[PDB]
Amino acid sequence: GTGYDLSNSVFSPDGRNFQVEYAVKAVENGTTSIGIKCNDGVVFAVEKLITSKLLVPQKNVKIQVVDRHIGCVYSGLIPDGRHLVNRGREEAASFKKLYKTPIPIPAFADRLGQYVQAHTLYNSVRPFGVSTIFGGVDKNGAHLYMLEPSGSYWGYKGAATGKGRQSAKAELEKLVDHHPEGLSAREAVKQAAKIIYLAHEDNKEKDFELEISWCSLSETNGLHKFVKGDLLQEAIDFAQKEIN
Amino acid sequence: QFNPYGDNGGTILGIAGEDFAVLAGDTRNITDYSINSRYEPKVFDCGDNIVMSANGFAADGDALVKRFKNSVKWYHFDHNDKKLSINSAARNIQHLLYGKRFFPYYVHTII
Amino acid sequence: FRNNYDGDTVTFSPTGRLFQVEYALEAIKQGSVTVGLRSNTHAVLVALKRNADELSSYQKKIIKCDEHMGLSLAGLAPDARVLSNYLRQQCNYSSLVFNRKLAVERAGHLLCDKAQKNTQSYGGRPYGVGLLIIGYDKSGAHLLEFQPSGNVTELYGTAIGARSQGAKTYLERTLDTFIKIDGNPDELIKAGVEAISQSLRDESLTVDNLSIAIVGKDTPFTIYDGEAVAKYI
Amino acid sequence: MDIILGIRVQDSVILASSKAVTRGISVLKDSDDKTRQLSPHTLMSFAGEAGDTVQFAEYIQANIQLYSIREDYELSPQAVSSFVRQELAKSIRSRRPYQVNVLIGGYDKKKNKPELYQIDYLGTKVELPYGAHGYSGFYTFSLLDHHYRPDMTTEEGLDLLKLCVQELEKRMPMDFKGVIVKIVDKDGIRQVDDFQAQ
Amino acid sequence: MTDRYSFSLTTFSPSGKLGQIDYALTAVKQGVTSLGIKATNGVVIATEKKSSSPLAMSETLSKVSLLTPDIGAVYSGMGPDYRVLVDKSRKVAHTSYKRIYGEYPPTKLLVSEVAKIMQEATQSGGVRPFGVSLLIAGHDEFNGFSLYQVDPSGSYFPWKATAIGKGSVAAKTFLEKRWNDELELEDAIHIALLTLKESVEGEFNGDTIELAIIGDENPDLLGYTGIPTDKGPRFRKLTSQEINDRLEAL
Amino acid sequence: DRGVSTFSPEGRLFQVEYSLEAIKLGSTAIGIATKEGVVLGVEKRATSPLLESDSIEKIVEIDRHIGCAMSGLTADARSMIEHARTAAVTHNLYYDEDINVESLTQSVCDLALRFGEGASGEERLMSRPFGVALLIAGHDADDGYQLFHAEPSGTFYRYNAKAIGSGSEGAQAELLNEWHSSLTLKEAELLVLKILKQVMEEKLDENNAQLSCITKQDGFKIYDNEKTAELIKELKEKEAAE
Amino acid sequence: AGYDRHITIFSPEGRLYQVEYAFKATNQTNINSLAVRGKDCTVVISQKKVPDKLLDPTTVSYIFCISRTIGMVVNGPIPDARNAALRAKAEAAEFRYKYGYDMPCDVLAKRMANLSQIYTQRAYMRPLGVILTFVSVDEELGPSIYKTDPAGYYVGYKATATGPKQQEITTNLENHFKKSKIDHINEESWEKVVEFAITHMIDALGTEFSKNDLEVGVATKDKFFTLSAENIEERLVAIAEQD
Amino acid sequence: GYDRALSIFSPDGHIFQVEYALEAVKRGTCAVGVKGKNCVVLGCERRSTLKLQDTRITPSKVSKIDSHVVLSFSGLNADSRILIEKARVEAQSHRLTLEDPVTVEYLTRYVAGVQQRYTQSGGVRPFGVSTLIAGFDPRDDEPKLYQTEPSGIYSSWSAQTIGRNSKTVREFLEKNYDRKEPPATVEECVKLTVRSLLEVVQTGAKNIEITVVKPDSDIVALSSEEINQYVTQIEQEKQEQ
Amino acid sequence: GSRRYDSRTTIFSPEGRLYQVEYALESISHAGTAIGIMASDGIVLAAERKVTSTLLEQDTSTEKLYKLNDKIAVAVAGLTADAEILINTARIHAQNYLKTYNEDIPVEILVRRLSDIKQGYTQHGGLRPFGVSFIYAGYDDRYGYQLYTSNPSGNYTGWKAISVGANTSAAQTLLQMDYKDDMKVDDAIELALKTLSKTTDSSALTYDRLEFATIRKGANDGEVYQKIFKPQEIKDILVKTGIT
Secondary structure, three states: OOOOOOOOOOOOOOOOOHHHHHHHHHHHOOOOEEEEEOOOEEEEEEEEEOOOOOEOOOOOOOOEEEOOOEEEEEEEOHHHHHHHHHHHHHHHHHHHHHHOOOOOHHHHHHHHHHHHHHOOOOOOEOOOOEEEEEEEEEOOEEEEEEEOOOOOEEEEOEEEEOOOHHHHHHHHHHHHHOOOOOOOHHHHHHHHHHHHHHHHHHOOOOOEEEEEEEEEOOOOOOOOEEOOHHHHHHHHHHHHHHOO | OOOOOOOOOOOEEEEEOOOOEEEEEOOOEEEOOEEEEOOOOOOEEOOOOOEEEEEEOHHHHHHHHHHHHHHHHHHHHHOOOOOOOHHHHHHHHHHHHHOOOOOOOOEEEEO | OHHHOOOOOOOOOOOOOOHHHHHHHHHHHOOOOEEEEEOOOEEEEEEEOOEOOOOEOEOOOEEEEEOOEEEEEEEOHHHHHHHHHHHHHHHHHHHHHHOOOOOHHHHHHHHHHHHHOOOOEOOOOOOOEEEEEEEEEOOEEEEEEEEOOOEEEEEOEEEEOOOOHHHHHHHHHHHHHHOOOOOOHHHHHHHHHHHHOOOOOOOOOOOOOEEEEEEEOOEEEEEEEOHHHHOOO | OOOEEEEEOOOEEEEEEEOOEEEOOEEEEOOOOOEEEEEOOEEEEEEEOOOHHHHHHHHHHHHHHHHHHHHOOOOOHHHHHHHHHHHHHHHOOOOOOOOEEEEEEEEEOOOOEEEEEEEOOOOOEEEOOEEEEOOHHHHHHHHHHHHOOOOOOHHHHHHHHHHHHHHHHHHOOOOOOOEEEEEEEOOEEEEOOOOOOO | OOOOOOOEOOOEOOOOOEHHHHHHHHHHHHOOOEEEEEEOOEEEEEEEOOOOOOOEEHHHOOOOEEEEOOEEEEEEEOHHHHHHHHHHHHHHHHHHHHHHHOOOOOHHHHHHHHHHHHHHOOOOEOEOOOOEEEEEEEEEOOOEEEEEEEOOOOOEEEEOEEEEOOOHHHHHHHHHHHOOOOOOHHHHHHHHHHHHHHHOOOOOOOOOEEEEEEOOOOHHHOOOOOOOOOOOOOEEEOOHHHHHHHHHOO | OOOOOOEOOOOOEHHHHHHHHHHHOOOOEEEEEEOOEEEEEEEOOOOOOOEOHHHOOOEEEEEOOEEEEEEEOHHHHHHHHHHHHHHHHHHHHHHOOOOOHHHHHHHHHHHHOOOEOOOOOOOOOEOOOOOEEEEEEEEEOOOEEEEEEEOOOOOEEEEOEEEEOOOHHHHHHHHHHHOOOOOOHHHHHHHHHHHHHHHOOOOOOOOOEEEEEEEOOOEEEEOOHHHHHHHHHHHHHHHHOO | OOOOOOOOOOOOOOOOHHHHHHHHHOOOOOOOEEEEEOOOEEEEEEEOOOOOOOEOHHHOOOEEEOOOOOEEEEEOOHHHHHHHHHHHHHHHHHHHHHHOOOOOHHHHHHHHHHHHHHHHHEOOOOOOOOEEEEEEEEOOOEEEEEEEOOOOOEEEEOEEEEOOOHHHHHHHHHHHHHHHOOOOOOOOOHHHHHHHHHHHHHHHHOOOOOOOOEEEEEEEOOEEEEOOHHHHHHHHHHHHOOO | OOOOOOOOOOOOOOOHHHHHHHHHHHOOOOEEEEEOOOOEEEEEEOOOOOOOEOOOOOOOOOEEEEOOEEEEEEEOHHHHHHHHHHHHHHHHHHHHHHOOOOOHHHHHHHHHHHHHHOOOOOOEOOOOEEEEEEEOOOOOOOOEEEEEOOOOOEEEEOEEEEOOOHHHHHHHHHOOOOOOOOOOOHHHHHHHHHHHHHHHHOOOOOOEEEEEEEOOOEEEEOOHHHHHHHHHHHHHHHHOO | OOHHHOOOOOOEOOOOOEHHHHHHHHHHOOOOOEEEEEOOOEEEEEEEOOOOOOOEOOOOOOOOEEEOOOOEEEEEEEOHHHHHHHHHHHHHHHHHHHHHHOOOOOHHHHHHHHHHHHHHHHHEOOOOOOOEEEEEEEEEOOOEEEEEEEOOOOOEEEEOEEEEOOOHHHHHHHHHHHOOOOOOHHHHHHHHHHHHHHHOOOOOOOHHHEEEEEEEOOOOOOOOEEEEOOHHHHHHHHHHOOOO
């Protein structure tokens, strides 16, 4: 029969969960955002569509920090993303409280994973309308991750999601091939600014605002910090230059 | 064993004039035979032309005044910024105090 | 289509839309118009009050949250009472516990999160009201736009309600102008009353029809109604 | 404590209860009726802790009246006393126990015999020819043990009581201000308004 | 989250049928045949171990389970449902009886308990009836040997002999021909093995057949000595070998 | 089916909208506010001649300074009145003063949207909205005489005059022309009595209609039949005098 | 009527469609796996497919270390697979805590099957679209393989296979045991058992494997571990010098 | 845990579950009440779908809530018991706290409130019952007669009927009951009551039970004969014309 | 959400009927017939075992007659399992009463309780009603011998003779025909067997398909005795009443 796509925890005859699949549509419909793992950290970047001149520039921050060493960015329904970060925060605090050490990225990923997957188990809740790219530096290295509405997530070398996800993935694959030895914190910040600009062609209509953040063992001491002022403009230019 | 109460001394005085009123209090705060402060305000202006002092156990006095001030704030929010008459403040404070009838605010309060 | 995916908030449509939330957004549009704009020293709220009969009053559209914060509503009044009340507590909590005035940006995050919990759970319904939050904190004047979808945005100015698009184009045009109306409250208020009358059509703002509010550098959030706004009509 | 006496004669049950209510140093009242009618043919006297005393009595009463109406029937004195005992037995192991002792005097219209029940606050029930709570038995049981006969008439019983009360007024340290006497028989409950000098 | 299914999933239809129970009985019908025969001095329950793959180890899967040392059960229908029912049965036997009276419950009572658990899955909110029919055989001092059948509805009835599942009709018929009130345990085991043969299509040996009995006490299966009154369990699962031995005299 | 707290594509709450339909079927209730007090009148509307009309209670006291009239599913109003009375008494206990009419109304309206099957906002345990509207009339120092209209939507409006019920649109139009800032308690009474007569199916008399008022001096009072029978007579005369 | 296909209640045929559909989801990953028992070890082989180049291959695994002794491989979407793994780990930990000894592989299997059986009966919980294969060298049963499905069913195996081409791998193994006449791989080293596993994985699927096309798990007395691309490469090299 | 909204509004502003609750009342045996000048009489018809009953024990239609108040009803029997129990309990609680038995109006308002609550509470359906509550306030002699319905609405009547064919019997009463002069006698009051039931009972000396309530907890139910005597005297009035 | 699958077992039909109760009754109408006849010196409870087999152990069976108290018993018509749930609570209610008042529970009080429990499943909780109809046969010193009946609706009534289950119409007519107020237990026992015998949907009315019980005040004692006839005792009384 039909109606398989009306309730959240229902399996369709082919084994799918249509509600999760529809949530993905809300993700693909949102802004594009990315993550670039480097030789000792990770860089996060995102497209901030400017609805009008009325939006105060640099104010509506979209990238979020969890604990002191983790960055999270997402595409889709923004409120769902915040909801997910609040949980990540409680999850991180909880882990630190009991184990003393700040939560490992792999560990943090699964906390988010199990929580999101949980929202695909009952028809009394709806799946998350966001794909989240997040990561940071821990006891043994840098880690980049992307979490889908289905609760699925994996470790990435580079990741993208949203409106211009294909452009970005394309650019990322090139970087991966042309830099087998690893990109650098400084470089990835620029490379990120570029990929966002390029990927903006799938939304070229409205003017946008760039936002980057990073977490590098050498550049930020292993803490998550936003890219501002000089280093920011420097990357914006590196992009504006290669978009021509 | 643990004693939740303490005594910070102090003395306060309230006199009702005909078209005025005063509420005084020394500024000495003590613990046993030591002075904690030579100047620790004990009488407060709570808005709507109401002054209050909760003398005795300082922690309790502070909590009570703080709770009453916040009470005045909500009075405004809930009753279209109406002013809180001194008699209405008094009745309100009674309920604040009696709410802890079994773990009293160890203070002698005057408004 | 839609008819099969709008029976509750817990359901996504095939395109990835949340209809119950959109229907909520609609209650806003159907609401009276209100405008918000700020300089670097002040923030102003101007709203058009609507009445039922000529024998009824003009339902208020502005609510104070603390001495430094307040908002204007558009849509379901009760939901604004609930949201403003929650905001009143958060402000209160910030003062009592940390003896700190709540940052407008943070009040926005709190509102966003409260609204979001009503768009992911069964039996609950989205809030059917839009809010314009203004306030002066440790980083200056601020104006926020709150949408029932949980989306909060910081702007120099904006408007919501029926025909709101009028005032919004006006402001987007007047930007460079009003943004500098510092140290001069009356000038920002007039600039605001001009933006709102850009959404008129039915009538013209009268004395018991206009409602204005302001907060700023040395101005505790206060509301003006009737005779008090006469000097702006 | 107060005085709670009960005696079951041939065709009725007599309950004598002191009239004094003392609070500390002063006698607040001297006309208190330490009794509640549980049904047309069942009466209950009580003594004990200051507030629990009437609170319990009235609670038991309300329950019996509710039963009477729901069933359009009157429970036997035995059934009422078992209900009352169970209530006290629950109370004794509760947070704050009802410190009340009671005597239940009723006339069983089905058996056609008067019945007297003694139940203390622990829920200790026993059926007796005559009983009392507190120190009362200490002064009167030797008299009852002597003059009591199962075939006594209501008039003979009131005489034996009068004797008991006289002993109480002689040897007991407290002035309980006389007693109020009530009779329970096939015709309901009635009060002997003349025992002050009968 | 939170189970918001606080209403019944089984309700009466206009005809008066209880759909889910009917459907559950249908699930039982597709199940592999199992049976029980009561002798004058014992009871036998048996079934076929329909292995789902030759790589699977059919011994690691028991269709005949010990509930108490004097009661066993076998079923037809949904295996997984049976498994949890057994855990609950073994537990209720303790919590609602052994921990109270110091002894194991009599067969009818335990059956009564199991039946209750199944009845609840017929009326409680948010669940479906169990898709199984059990056959429970046991012995107790005051009732001797007995055999009961418990259905999805929670209904249970005593039998002298009976079968459930796939070829129950045929098997029940074959049993009415060979049963009498004077069968000895070994006779019933024999009749059981014959009845089961009609239902089995492929291999029919001690590794494809699961069979257990409620007979005499096995002091050798007690684990200790020293207490006269403790004589051992009356329940016993026949070994692969024990079955084949009797298969020759088939 | 469909959640009891669902939005229509127009941004309205179905249950509340349907709630209003029920109110339109209720008896007419009219309120008029003058600087001399507020008058509240209602249509008894007995369903049978055997029904003892004075047992029809559609005008009730909330406190000595607040009264209210109801229209629609009247039974649904008992708990509202109860809540209202408690709210007023409680306020007085906590502040040694009278509760402001507007505040009393706000408290009542807070109940309005507390319905649903598990809405993520608190513990709104009530299966449906109220099927009745209320006219709340009272007096207080800060805003004097007041008339409010509390609906199952949660919103309430202040009116100088207002009619709710089956005859509302008709009666409201009337009040539009008849009301002016200088009315007197006397005028208002006749005016309410008159407009009721126009919209009532029955011939208005002191048995199928009831008046009341609230004055700073004597509080809220419900006019007994006799007192009203006369106000009716006095009306018939003034109308017949042109 | 038509809702007997959305929640776990019986259909008129006495079926549970949702459970059936959950089974369909187990093949979503298009991964095949197989497990065999050695003389004193247990090996689980599973295909590893990393399509996207942007993915960090080291984080793409369907094999889990449940406890020091139990290993679990999953066939089904990763989110449900991780849900099952976390639960299994918690269950194994708690069991050791309450009963004083390591939870046996077959017992954890039964526990997980029981949990699954519940999603089959209670309507608010959906089944998990996964099949769980648990392996270990039990201290009482020796090399062990127990597999559970969305139906709440579980059983022990001599060897087993799961995935889209499950049937080919199964019959391949079946044939091998009909031949050897024993219920295990008569090998002393696990390295050889791992080789046999990879070999027959190839014969049956008719495909060659590089060091990154496989994922291997090995259970031995007191330990379960997974191999590295290089540990596997070493295995691949050895099978190459025989063919 | 079950809280589904069963009583909700429909587009036309109606609450069907409540409305249907009334259909259950229309299907119940008729019940009538008429107040005299010094009493109140309650009459109820007895079904005849099956007869071989044991009238001694079968629950009667009129129930005592307290010694001075009675309640009769039309609709689902099982539902009425739940209301009667709550009523009786409330009557005892009132005496225990106010130290005075309930007034008829109070007891009525209480039952009506219970009914109203079941019209807007999750997980429950309204009561398929309508009641007539009659009696005398403590130390008062003015008769009281009230009626409640599934909606929770109540009010007093000089005379009133509910249930099947109540339409007919109410008409009889509207043109046979003069408020100016109420049945000044317990006898002529009971007569009027029987007369109204005959319009619908269709000869039922055994199908018409009556209860008379007088001041000071004076409640008594008549017997077949006593009633049958009124039936007899009434049929002649017709023929003697 | 869940609402989609809720049957709403406790609502009114537009006619003012309770669907589930109606259907439950329909279900009961197919249950083996059970009869109750009240004599002047006792009461009889007879029931027909619906469906049987040769292998059915009829000695250890008891599917229709249950002892509730020492002076009360019930005859069951409907879902046996459902009946056992109720019987057990009834057994408990009887004892609570005994413990509280030291007197056996008056028959109506026990019947009213079970009925109120049934009535509950009719007005709230969203659960299906119990598909059970009871015939209570009991004695107490207030009304002596009593016969009651309760069905899914939670309604109960008193009778001199009554039937529940299948063909109650034909059965009720036969009872109304031969019943006489002055009957005697043995007369009743015969009426019971005759009635079943004529309404049976089976060939003959053998003993293996019957359950019999009587509540007599055995003259030789002065107290009440409950007797649940044993297979043999039934086979006997079956030959004597000329049904061999």
